[PDB]
Design a protein around this motif. Structure first.
Motif, PDB file in Angstrom:
ATOM      1  N   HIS A  10       0.579  -8.674  -7.206  1.00 33.04           N
ATOM      2  CA  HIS A  10       1.328  -8.338  -8.409  1.00 33.04           C
ATOM      3  C   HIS A  10       2.724  -7.832  -8.084  1.00 33.04           C
ATOM      4  CE1 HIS A  10      -2.871  -8.347  -9.611  1.00 33.04           C
ATOM      5  NE2 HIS A  10      -2.478  -8.508 -10.861  1.00 33.04           N
ATOM      6  N   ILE A  11       3.702  -8.355  -8.814  1.00 32.83           N
ATOM      7  CA  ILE A  11       5.098  -7.990  -8.628  1.00 32.83           C
ATOM      8  C   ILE A  11       5.648  -7.361  -9.903  1.00 32.83           C
ATOM      9  CG2 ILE A  11       7.403  -8.868  -8.182  1.00 32.83           C
ATOM     10  CD1 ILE A  11       5.720 -11.291  -6.770  1.00 32.83           C
ATOM     11  N   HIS A  12       5.482  -6.049 -10.026  1.00 38.61           N
ATOM     12  CA  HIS A  12       5.961  -5.325 -11.196  1.00 38.61           C
ATOM     13  C   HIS A  12       7.481  -5.249 -11.160  1.00 38.61           C
ATOM     14  CE1 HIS A  12       5.118  -3.008 -14.729  1.00 38.61           C
ATOM     15  NE2 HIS A  12       5.760  -1.940 -14.292  1.00 38.61           N
ATOM     16  N   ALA A  13       8.127  -6.349 -11.532  1.00 37.30           N
ATOM     17  CA  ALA A  13       9.582  -6.424 -11.539  1.00 37.30           C
ATOM     18  C   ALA A  13      10.184  -5.706 -12.739  1.00 37.30           C
ATOM     19  CB  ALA A  13      10.025  -7.881 -11.526  1.00 37.30           C
ATOM     20  N   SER A  14      10.862  -4.595 -12.472  1.00 36.13           N
ATOM     21  CA  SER A  14      11.504  -3.812 -13.520  1.00 36.13           C
ATOM     22  C   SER A  14      12.987  -3.679 -13.188  1.00 36.13           C
ATOM     23  CB  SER A  14      10.861  -2.427 -13.621  1.00 36.13           C
ATOM     24  OG  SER A  14      11.464  -1.656 -14.646  1.00 36.13           O
ATOM     25  N   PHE A  15      13.714  -2.928 -14.007  1.00 32.44           N
ATOM     26  CA  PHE A  15      15.142  -2.733 -13.792  1.00 32.44           C
ATOM     27  C   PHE A  15      15.452  -1.553 -12.879  1.00 32.44           C
ATOM     28  CE2 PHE A  15      17.518  -5.557 -16.741  1.00 32.44           C
ATOM     29  CZ  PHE A  15      16.438  -6.183 -17.352  1.00 32.44           C
ATOM     30  N   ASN A  16      15.047  -0.359 -13.299  1.00 30.50           N
ATOM     31  CA  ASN A  16      15.299   0.848 -12.523  1.00 30.50           C
ATOM     32  C   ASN A  16      14.534   0.870 -11.203  1.00 30.50           C
ATOM     33  OD1 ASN A  16      15.141   1.373 -15.622  1.00 30.50           O
ATOM     34  ND2 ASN A  16      16.640   2.870 -14.876  1.00 30.50           N
ATOM     35  N   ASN A  17      13.654  -0.108 -11.007  1.00 32.33           N
ATOM     36  CA  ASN A  17      12.863  -0.186  -9.782  1.00 32.33           C
ATOM     37  C   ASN A  17      11.913  -1.381  -9.810  1.00 32.33           C
ATOM     38  OD1 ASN A  17      11.799   1.758  -7.312  1.00 32.33           O
ATOM     39  ND2 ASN A  17      10.175   0.481  -8.191  1.00 32.33           N
ATOM     40  N   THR A  18      11.398  -1.743  -8.640  1.00 36.13           N
ATOM     41  CA  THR A  18      10.460  -2.853  -8.510  1.00 36.13           C
ATOM     42  C   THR A  18       9.404  -2.499  -7.470  1.00 36.13           C
ATOM     43  OG1 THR A  18      11.986  -4.633  -9.159  1.00 36.13           O
ATOM     44  CG2 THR A  18      10.155  -5.224  -7.705  1.00 36.13           C
ATOM     45  N   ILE A  19       8.161  -2.883  -7.737  1.00 33.38           N
ATOM     46  CA  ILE A  19       7.060  -2.596  -6.826  1.00 33.38           C
ATOM     47  C   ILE A  19       6.035  -3.723  -6.784  1.00 33.38           C
ATOM     48  CG2 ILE A  19       7.143  -0.089  -6.715  1.00 33.38           C
ATOM     49  CD1 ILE A  19       5.525   0.052  -9.241  1.00 33.38           C
ATOM     50  N   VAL A  20       5.636  -4.104  -5.573  1.00 34.11           N
ATOM     51  CA  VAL A  20       4.664  -5.172  -5.379  1.00 34.11           C
ATOM     52  C   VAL A  20       3.423  -4.661  -4.654  1.00 34.11           C
ATOM     53  CG1 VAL A  20       4.219  -7.407  -4.320  1.00 34.11           C
ATOM     54  CG2 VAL A  20       6.465  -6.915  -5.294  1.00 34.11           C
ATOM     55  N   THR A  21       2.253  -4.942  -5.221  1.00 37.35           N
ATOM     56  CA  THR A  21       0.990  -4.518  -4.630  1.00 37.35           C
ATOM     57  C   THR A  21       0.115  -5.724  -4.303  1.00 37.35           C
ATOM     58  OG1 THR A  21      -1.073  -3.291  -5.024  1.00 37.35           O
ATOM     59  CG2 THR A  21       0.053  -4.214  -6.949  1.00 37.35           C
ATOM     60  N   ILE A  22      -0.247  -5.857  -3.030  1.00 42.05           N
ATOM     61  CA  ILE A  22      -1.077  -6.969  -2.579  1.00 42.05           C
ATOM     62  C   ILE A  22      -2.553  -6.664  -2.813  1.00 42.05           C
ATOM     63  CG2 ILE A  22      -0.942  -8.742  -0.806  1.00 42.05           C
ATOM     64  CD1 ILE A  22       1.685  -7.401  -1.193  1.00 42.05           C
ATOM     65  N   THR A  23      -2.984  -6.763  -4.066  1.00 41.46           N
ATOM     66  CA  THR A  23      -4.374  -6.498  -4.424  1.00 41.46           C
ATOM     67  C   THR A  23      -5.283  -7.644  -3.988  1.00 41.46           C
ATOM     68  OG1 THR A  23      -5.915  -6.172  -6.274  1.00 41.46           O
ATOM     69  CG2 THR A  23      -3.941  -7.483  -6.689  1.00 41.46           C
ATOM     70  N   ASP A  24      -6.591  -7.431  -4.089  1.00 35.82           N
ATOM     71  CA  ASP A  24      -7.554  -8.452  -3.700  1.00 35.82           C
ATOM     72  C   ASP A  24      -7.833  -9.399  -4.862  1.00 35.82           C
ATOM     73  OD1 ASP A  24      -9.394  -7.314  -5.502  1.00 35.82           O
ATOM     74  OD2 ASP A  24     -11.063  -7.596  -4.108  1.00 35.82           O
ATOM     75  N   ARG A  25      -8.756 -10.327  -4.643  1.00 33.49           N
ATOM     76  CA  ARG A  25      -9.136 -11.310  -5.651  1.00 33.49           C
ATOM     77  C   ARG A  25      -9.523 -10.686  -6.991  1.00 33.49           C
ATOM     78  NH1 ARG A  25     -12.446 -12.102  -0.443  1.00 33.49           N
ATOM     79  NH2 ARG A  25     -12.367 -14.338  -0.948  1.00 33.49           N
ATOM     80  N   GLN A  26     -10.527  -9.814  -6.973  1.00 33.39           N
ATOM     81  CA  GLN A  26     -10.995  -9.158  -8.190  1.00 33.39           C
ATOM     82  C   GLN A  26      -9.869  -8.356  -8.833  1.00 33.39           C
ATOM     83  OE1 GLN A  26     -14.158 -10.614  -5.921  1.00 33.39           O
ATOM     84  NE2 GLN A  26     -13.666 -10.500  -8.108  1.00 33.39           N
ATOM     85  N   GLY A  27      -9.061  -7.714  -7.996  1.00 32.18           N
ATOM     86  CA  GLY A  27      -7.958  -6.915  -8.492  1.00 32.18           C
ATOM     87  C   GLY A  27      -8.004  -5.495  -7.960  1.00 32.18           C
ATOM     88  N   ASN A  28      -8.367  -5.351  -6.689  1.00 32.85           N
ATOM     89  CA  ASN A  28      -8.450  -4.039  -6.058  1.00 32.85           C
ATOM     90  C   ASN A  28      -7.248  -3.800  -5.154  1.00 32.85           C
ATOM     91  OD1 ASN A  28     -11.291  -5.237  -6.506  1.00 32.85           O
ATOM     92  ND2 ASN A  28     -11.703  -3.036  -6.340  1.00 32.85           N
ATOM     93  N   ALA A  29      -6.723  -2.580  -5.182  1.00 36.32           N
ATOM     94  CA  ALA A  29      -5.567  -2.227  -4.367  1.00 36.32           C
ATOM     95  C   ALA A  29      -5.869  -2.337  -2.878  1.00 36.32           C
ATOM     96  CB  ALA A  29      -5.106  -0.816  -4.702  1.00 36.32           C
ATOM     97  N   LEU A  30      -5.085  -3.154  -2.182  1.00 34.75           N
ATOM     98  CA  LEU A  30      -5.251  -3.343  -0.748  1.00 34.75           C
ATOM     99  C   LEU A  30      -4.000  -2.847  -0.037  1.00 34.75           C
ATOM    100  CD1 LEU A  30      -6.734  -6.959  -0.606  1.00 34.75           C
ATOM    101  CD2 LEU A  30      -7.972  -4.806  -0.336  1.00 34.75           C
TER     102      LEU A  30
END
Lengths: 117, 51, 150
Positions: A10-30
């Motif tokens: 997931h690539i939470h692309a925002s203006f004041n900041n941006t953050i990408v989290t490489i979660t797993d298939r189901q959707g768990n934070a890795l």
RNA sequence: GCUUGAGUCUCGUAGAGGGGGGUAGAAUUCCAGGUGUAGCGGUGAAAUGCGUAGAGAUCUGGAGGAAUACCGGUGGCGAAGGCGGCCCCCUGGACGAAGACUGACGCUCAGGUGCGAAAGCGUGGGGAGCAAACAGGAUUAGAUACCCUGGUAGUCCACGCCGUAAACGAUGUCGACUUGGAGGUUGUGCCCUUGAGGCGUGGCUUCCGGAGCUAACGCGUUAAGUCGACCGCCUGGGGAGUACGGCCGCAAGGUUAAAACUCAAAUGAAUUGACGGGGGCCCGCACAAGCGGUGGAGCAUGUGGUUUAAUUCGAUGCAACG
């Protein structure tokens, strides 16, 4: 030490900041990255070439497994919708499907008046 | 919006969906709404599209 | 402003005949006393013999290598505030610029005399020393080090 | 008596016209739980705020309210105000066409009755987002503001009240005339209907524009042109849509509506220029690129001060001070 093999990112692309989290298939934070946590803060971030160094930091925390392939979830506009996917393509990861999960309603809630200078 | 291609490569195809929604109907929201400001500026910008 | 011509063809060194060394003596020159400049650098330039012992010629260029930047900043009155958008540096000024740092910082060295206070700096150049070499990274820490705007 | 005005009948057409009831999908917020970990959020920066009691991110399930992306248009419907998801129920108007029917039954309309954006009011519901008030943080000389973090009424529903808006086309309703051009939307006739299609003939509607009209801007068959019928309204600016009285209202307040006194103008369009923290294009050591300075220091010189019996007069933003 789980070896997820493949998991969307997931690539939470925002203006004041941006953050990408490489979660797993189901959707768990890795492993998640963050511009604010990528040295430069204040507002110097935002810029694409600044987020790329952020998400790339994941290949240092989520590399403990062995992601051989992964998709991409781009949400919201801002300087980090392209940069992120790019840095990921060089980091060594693969790709399975790119998509924009930006919340585009149908005139539901009434946005904030705000800004007026 | 749904991408998918064989033969690993970071070509693009992505800006293809970037013509129906994307950062547009986004910033369209972003700040406040419109109400009378649109029905007006929407009917004035139309005048522009003439020549 | 809009004027667009060419560069000022400089006269080569009083011996080796080299534009690269030409504008070098000029950048080092002072009070139009060009004579002293020659007799001040042309000496230290060869005094390298005592500092080495051979055909001291390329030593100059090699010494400047450790003082040749390739990226600089440039504030721009845009976006309401003032940008910085850093950009590289063409060769025309690369060699030139360096020469300044090599001299404009060789004066504050505070050694025996400008004639020698300069010589040592060259050896420190290729061997990384003095503000001359410092200015490089102390400048690079902006460009290529803040591409966020570049 | 008559039928072309007006109306009825038939059969079609398009429509976000209205009232009621359903229902769907996207998003927000919140509640719960999983993963995971030191940031998130915000700004020009920041800070308040939220985070190790585990946020943000992410994923699963649930609750709830408001509004219906795309289609959507220079579009459509309505008397006006206004009216956008899909479905059903009750209902109004507009238009076309062969026609058939009534037979001037019409136009306007003071008073009267009714409808009226939003904000506001009463009772009772509801309450996600947004947001007067209010509270923090910031900005600033100050900042009871703009900005940021929160947030109550309210915004939503029912039912009753209030009647105002730049309620604007700033242009009353009805009818007849008067060169044209390009387009939009909807009905109908016709044409190898062989077609996207082509030719007409009605409704509504955009833009350009001729005569004419106009103070000019501009309006120009949807007229601000040429005429006719009825109604509302104006008579210098300020004082003032105020006071007083009446009427209406729960209350805000509305409606009707002066004088005293005061000024010689108030005003409309258009012209010339000046200026704009408006736009386009330019030049100047204006800036940027560098070389050396001034600002500190001792001394020279002038000036403002201060002083002096006098410190002779003048020069004072760039254009005053060797």
């Amino acid at each position: 030490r789980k070896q997820v093999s493949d998991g969307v990112a997931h690539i939470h692309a925002s203006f004041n900041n941006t953050i990408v989290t490489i979660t797993d298939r189901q959707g768990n934070a890795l492993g998640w990255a963050t511009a604010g946590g990528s040295g430069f803060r204040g507002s110097r971030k935002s810029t694409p070439f600044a987020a790329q160094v952020a998400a790339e930091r994941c290949a240092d925390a989520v590399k403990e497994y062995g992601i051989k392939n992964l998709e991409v979830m781009v949400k919201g506009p801002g300087p980090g919708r392209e940069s992120t996917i790019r840095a990921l393509n060089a980091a060594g990861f693969r790709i399975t499907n790119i998509t924009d999960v930006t919340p585009i309603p149908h005139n539901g809630c009434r946005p904030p008046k705000k800004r007026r200078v | 919006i749904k991408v998918r291609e064989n033969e690993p490569f970071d070509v693009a195809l992505r800006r293809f969906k970037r013509s129906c929604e994307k950062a547009g109907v986004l910033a369209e929201v972003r700040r406040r709404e419109f109400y009378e400001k649109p029905t007006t500026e929407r009917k004035r910008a139309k005048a522009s599209a003439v020549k | 402003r809009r004027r667009v011509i060419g560069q000022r063809k400089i006269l080569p060194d009083p011996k080796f005949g080299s534009e690269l060394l030409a504008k070098f003596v000029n950048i080092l020159m002072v009070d139009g006393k060009k004579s002293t400049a020659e007799s001040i650098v042309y000496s230290a330039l060869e005094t390298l013999a005592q500092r080495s012992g051979k055909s001291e010629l390329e030593a100059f260029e090699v010494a400047l290598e450790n003082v040749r930047p390739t990226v600089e900043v440039k504030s721009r009155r845009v976006g309401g505030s003032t940008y910085q958008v850093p950009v590289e540096v063409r060769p025309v000024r690369r060699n030139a610029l360096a020469m300044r740092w090599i001299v404009e910082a060789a004066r504050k060295r505070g050694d025996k005399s400008m004639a020698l206070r300069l010589a040592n700096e060259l050896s420190d150049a290729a061997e990384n020393k003095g503000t001359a070499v410092k200015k490089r990274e102390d400048v690079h820490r902006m460009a290529e080090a803040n591409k966020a705007f570049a």
